[PDB]
Design a protein around this nucleic acid. Structure first.
Ligand SMILES: [Mg+2]
Lengths: 98, 49, 115, 48, 115
RNA sequence: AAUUUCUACUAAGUGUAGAUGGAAA
């Protein structure tokens, strides 16, 4: 139910900060406008569901996702600078995603 | 500046009989619901592609 | 003889469908994208009176941004999300879900669709 | 009748066809055992 | 005989003029009231191609708020200030000052009139 | 729906937010 969820812990095991990344919040000119990216993906998927050939409605989604992991790179290279931390990534060579 | 730049050209791939455009002053709609302002009216043209 | 009339009434139909589209695309141009109605695209004019819905070569998707051509002012549409590039010229609303179309939606219901 | 890109019946059918064919090719590909001892070369011959 | 065709092409003209009006009233509906163009009102359809401008029974005023009827959706207009109650149905822009009309203004110039 | 290009846009009006290593095969 979240494309990518972020928690950042202390040296001792406290949840310093937790939130979801279904809502990349663009921060322009002081006034912030949040732009969802899960509702968008759900709409595009329901669009694929009734498109009768989905060779071009299956490329659009493979591009939107790869256009959503280029606006989370910033919300991560923001945390890293803000906390001087390390990052923890699942190693895909040994995973069984459901 | 690691030298050795180049200069490319690419022709116009769209035929000028195909262009599509929101005309001037036509109140367009906005796709992202969180944005409160639900329309927009530019005073010129928005040539798609 | 009789093949200059029935080769002219097929211009009255075109000149009526252009008016119908002009009258629709000016109310699809207002609805917020998450309410626009399920349409039956096609690149040849569609008489929205009969339309012989039992036809097998017409789907029913949701209609995206209704733009307008450049050289003339023909109101071209866009089916589903835009980047599919499914630029279709004539449409007609239907209460039909994806393929099992039920009926054609009258105009005033498409206008009354905003709410 | 139309531009193939916009057209669907000449693409939806193409997909229904190539998808089934390629699924069969993907399913039968397993029957190799990748470089072994004796096998039924009478089978593997025509197979390959 | 020959009086069912030339009693039908006079429906192709009506069905084209309705489209022309529908295509205009959607661009008079945007201009700010102090720029709308000088029009030639009349309550019968006007072919904006020929219009025989030397006709003596057509003036050229400025066009006020372009409303839209209630039962059908015919785009009725309003000449000059509203409270004159000069509800006219078909119009056609002209570069003509009050009476000495000069020519008919093409559509794209009426659209390009906003500035 | 404007882009070196991609994505989401309209972001206060010829654009806003991120990202981007191209040429060859
Ligand atoms: Mg885009």
């Amino acid at each position: 139910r979240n494309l990518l969820y972020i928690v950042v812990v202390d040296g001792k095991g406290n949840i310093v900060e937790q939130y979801s990344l279904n809502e990349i919040i663009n921060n322009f000119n002081g006034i912030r406008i949040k732009t969802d990216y899960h509702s968008l993906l759900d709409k595009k998927e329901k669009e694929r569901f009734e498109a009768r050939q989905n060779w071009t409605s299956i490329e659009n989604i493979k591009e939107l996702k790869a256009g959503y992991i280029s606006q989370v790179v910033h919300k991560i290279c923001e945390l890293v600078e803000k906390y001087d931390a390390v990052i923890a990534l699942e190693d895909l060579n040994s995973g069984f995603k459901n | 500046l690691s030298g050795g730049a180049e200069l490319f050209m690419r022709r116009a791939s769209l035929k000028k009989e195909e262009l599509v455009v929101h005309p001037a002053n036509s109140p367009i709609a906005n796709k992202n619901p969180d944005n409160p302002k639900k329309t927009t009216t530019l005073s010129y043209d928005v040539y798609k592609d | 003889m009789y093949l200059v009339v029935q080769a002219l009434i097929r211009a009255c139909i075109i000149k009526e469908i252009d008016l119908y589209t002009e009258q629709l695309y000016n109310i699809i141009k207002s609805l917020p994208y998450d309410k626009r109605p399920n349409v039956v695209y096609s690149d040849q004019p569609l008489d929205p009176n009969n339309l012989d819905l039992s036809e097998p070569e017409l789907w029913a998707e949701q209609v995206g941004e209704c733009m307008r051509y450049a050289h003339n002012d023909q109101p071209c549409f866009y089916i589903g999300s835009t980047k599919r590039e499914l630029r279709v010229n004539y449409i007609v609303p239907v209460i039909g879900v994806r393929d099992e179309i039920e009926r054609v939606m009258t105009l005033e219901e498409v206008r009354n669709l905003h709410k | 009748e139309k531009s193939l890109k916009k057209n669907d019946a000449v693409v939806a059918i193409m997909k229904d066809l190539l998808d089934s064919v390629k699924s069969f090719e993907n399913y039968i590909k397993a029957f190799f055992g990748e470089k072994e001892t004796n096998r039924d070369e009478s089978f593997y011959g025509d197979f390959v």
